Each structure stands twice: as C-alpha cells, then as structure tokens.
C-alpha cells in the first residue's frame, strides 16, 4: 500500500521530524510513504494531489492551515479518497485532523517561568491571523491571569513571525523603562534572535533575561549557533505521526469511518536559556 | 512510462541536501517529470524496499545520494538491470554510473588559500570521518593548500574526528590548549565551525579576533532566521547546478537506454561571513 504526502517545500522545520516518523509508523502497518514538494507553487501542489488521488496512492496527508488550500481540501473531500490533515484549523470542514494544543503549550511555558520567580514576562507573537499564533498569545494571556500577574500591552510585541522579528521585538522590550525579566517567544527562531539582540545590548542570557521558545528547533539541526540552548516546548511529533498513520489505515480499511480530530499536548524541553529569579 | 523520477534518501534531515531536493523538483518540472521522495529512516532493508518500489514500475528512473559502502551491492544490482540511475556525491570505485559530484578537494584548497591571504600562517583542520571520500578530499585539499602556500604541515594542527555532535567543541579544546594555538581553523563542516566558535567563547576567546574560522556547507542558507552575529565564512555547495545536471542526465538516460554513464563535477564557492579577520 502507498500513503502520499504533499509538502509546500522541503525546509528545516519541525515537519522534518514528522516526515521520518510517518515512515517509521507506516512501515509498522506495512505501508510505503511517498513525499512530493510543490516548491511553494500551488499549481504543483494541485498537480501532486491529482497524481496521488489518481491511483499512485491509497491516501493523502497534508500539513498546515493555509487559507489558499481551503478550496483544494474541500475539492478532495467531495471525493471519498482517504485524507488526513496535520495542524489544520479550517472552520467549515469535517476531516481527519491531528493537531497540537498550542494554547496549553503557551500556558505551561508561562507557568514554568512563574515557577522560576519571574513576574515581568513578555511575549513576542507570531502572525495572529494564523490560529496557532493566536492560540499561543491567548495561552500567554490566560497564564498571566491564572498566576495573578498583570497584563501589559508593552510586554506584547505583535510580529508577522518573519526573519529578524525577534531582533526588533527584543529591542523594543529591552528599551522599556521597566524591561520583562523573561520572554516567551512564538517560536525558537525568535528566541535565538532575542538572545542575539540582548547580547548586542550587553545583556547576558539567562542571567539578565530568561527565554522560553517553541519547536525545540535544536533537535532538527542538532546544533544552534548561540551561547545557550533554548528551553522550549517540544511538539509530540512521534505521537502525531503514529496517530496520523492509524487514522489513515483505518480510513483505508473502511470508507464508512467518520473524520476524527486527535489533539496532543506539547512537552517542555529544559535547555540553558532560563534562570531562577530572587 | 510513468513520467516519475524516484529519489531514495537515508532520512529527512536539515543538511545542504534539503536545498538539493527542492531544486530536483524545480528542474524536473521543466522536463515534464514528477519527482517523488522516500526516506529509509536509516533502515537499509527499507532502502531496498523503496528501490524495489521504484524499479518495480512506480518511477522511470532513480536518484540516490552519497557514497556509503553499505549500498555498494544494491547499486551494482540496480546497474545490472538497465534501470535510469543517477547518483549524487558518489565515490564508488568499481562502477560505471551517472554521477554528479562536488569538488571537495578544491573547496578546501580555496578555503585555506583565503586564510593565507588574510595573513594566517598557523592554520588547523578539524576533519570529518576520513573513511568517507568527501572528508578525506577536504583533508587532502587542506594539506595540498598548505604546501602550495609554502607553509609546513603540522600533525598537531590536524584533529581527526568522526564529524559527530560536539566533535567541533572537543577539537577546539585540544587546538586552543596547544603551546602554540592555530590562528585560524578550517572545519570539515559548518556544524563543527559553529561548535568551535562556541567553545572558543567559553574559554574567553573572541571570534574572529582570537581565532578565524572557515567551514563548509554555508548551512546558514537553510536557516530562515539570524541565531548569531558571527556567520561562518564557508564553502557554498552548487546544489542548484548539481540538481539541474542530475535531472539532465536522468531524462537522457530514460530516453535512451544506450546513453553512456557520465561524471559531472561542480566547484564550490566561498561565502564571506563575519568569522574571519586579518592577521598582522
């Protein structure tokens, strides 16, 4: 049997670990896994979906929640072709989806910093128009309140999550009359950029500033060019892969199976970017 | 004919090969071919399974990366069958196969020439596993570069490693604790280079001031973010050119079974970062 996976492109994201895990679990169910890259060209993505639904595969797996793919996913769902999505937050559809609890991940990150004695905790957001980023910001806000901390507009830097977003965000935060003793970043890329800008301003990390990120990106590269390894929320990529294969196999053995949504919690990786405060 | 080119990888990882994969898709498109990738998850029997899947009819041709001696018999088997096969960075000695390679030797020569041009006379090398041709080619280029620049070879400036995690940190500790420390070091890869910069910092040294570092892969290219202010001066691999050449050899091979195996080589290019500075 063959399960097909279409990606927008090959890149060093957390999905690289997900890809290897799909092969591990598919092999356990005696299935082959085949991947295609669309080179971020939606025409090609549609071409690869047709290749798979046309007979090259028994099932298709897609990643993310990009609005441009709304029509395409709906198009695939009109058919009964087995489909499993990963981290998808489309409102109007009923489809097999394996998601991550981004909200509780942000809550646990802030709880962890509060447990270390931090009371001035900032957040550098992702693109809030995307559900994952909105959930991480909402989790941060809920955790401030649950821990009896005040919310401050100056401690939240809204970004589009692009490259250098961490540098400028850390610059605004550290130039405040009263700087966060700790920052929770939407992702590890921003976290590392925060550490870089801080050191440029003469601040030392974790001593002058504690940082907690998201994705545990060091695990992908196996090294980071920075003086510390980020404390970060780890995505359950192995559990996500197992669940996705299981949903697909079941969906393949019977077309009368209804769309199941399975959610998994993130786990905190303890790095060297955090320090206890008096 | 399926109009499909199959690629079998040992695993999905954050290496320079990530850029090669996207370029394979880009060039295949121009030749009206779909590209499909498989990961063996490092299971050799899994790799065999994927090769059988492709040669069994799922694809019209196959691409494999690297030069692992484990796969020598597999490659010979694929070659006995007339199936369209193109290898990338393969250094197997007894076969006639389409092969697209990178000039690792001259890349190392160009790296060392640059450090000599900056005034460095004490240049160390942290190697990769020398059992692999690429690591040995990078080591040999460094040696030849020392000789062409009228510098003496010093065994103490060559640290042999298997190129694994933390290999750069340990190598840097040995080199910097020498009676007379290298004023510059050429690492087998960027990962070792970044590890060298970090360990040097822990010993109270400042990079490029106390130590110039030149790596290989220009790995920063796959970082969609900025980790540090010290970016490695490093050799860039011609992955766009390699992918195009691989697909041109593959399409010709699928079209004509009697096309003879060709070996095409591409030079690396020096990327100037912020990890080097002038000596005296």
UniProtKB/TrEMBL annotation, chain A:
Organism in which the protein naturally occurs: Ruminiclostridium cellulolyticum (strain ATCC 35319 / DSM 5812 / JCM 6584 / H10)
Parent sequence residues shown: 60 to 337 of 337
UniProt KW keywords: DNA-binding, Transcription, Transcription regulation
UniProt KW Acyltransferase keyword: no
GO terms assigned for molecular function: DNA-binding transcription factor activity; transcription cis-regulatory region binding
Name of the featured protein: Transcriptional regulator, LacI family
């Amino acid at each position: 049997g063959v399960i097909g996976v279409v990606l927008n492109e090959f890149n060093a994201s957390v999905y690289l670990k997900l890809a290897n895990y799909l092969e591990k679990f598919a092999y356990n169910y005696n299935y082959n896994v085949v991947f295609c890259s669309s080179n971020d060209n939606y025409e090609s993505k549609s071409r690869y979906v047709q290749y798979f639904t046309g007979g090259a595969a028994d099932g298709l797996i897609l990643f993310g929640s990009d609005t441009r793919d709304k029509e395409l996913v709906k198009r695939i769902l009109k058919t009964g072709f087995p489909l499993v999505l990963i981290e998808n937050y489309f409102n109007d559809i009923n489809v097999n989806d394996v998601i991550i609890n981004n909200f509780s991940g942000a809550v646990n990150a802030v709880n962890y910093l509060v447990g270390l004695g931090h009371r001035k905790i900032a957040h550098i957001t992702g693109n809030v128009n995307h559900r994952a980023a909105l959930e991480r910001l909402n989790g941060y806000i809920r955790a401030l309140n649950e821990n009896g901390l005040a919310y401050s507009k100056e401690y939240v830097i809204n970004t589009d999550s692009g490259e250098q977003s961490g540098c400028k965000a850390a610059d605004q935060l550290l130039k405040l009359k009263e700087p966060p003793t700790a920052v929770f970043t939407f992702n590890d890329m921003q976290g590392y950029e925060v550490i870089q800008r801080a050191s440029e301003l003469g601040l030392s990390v974790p001593r002058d500033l504690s940082v907690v990120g998201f994705d545990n990106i060091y695990d992908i590269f196996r090294f980071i060019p920075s003086n510390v390894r980020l404390t970060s929320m780890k995505q359950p990529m192995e559990k996500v892969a197992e669940a996705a294969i299981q949903l697909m196999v079941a969906n393949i053995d019977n077309a009368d199976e209804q769309p199941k949504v399975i959610s998994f919690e993130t786990e905190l990786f303890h790095g060297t970017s955090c320090c206890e405060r008096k």
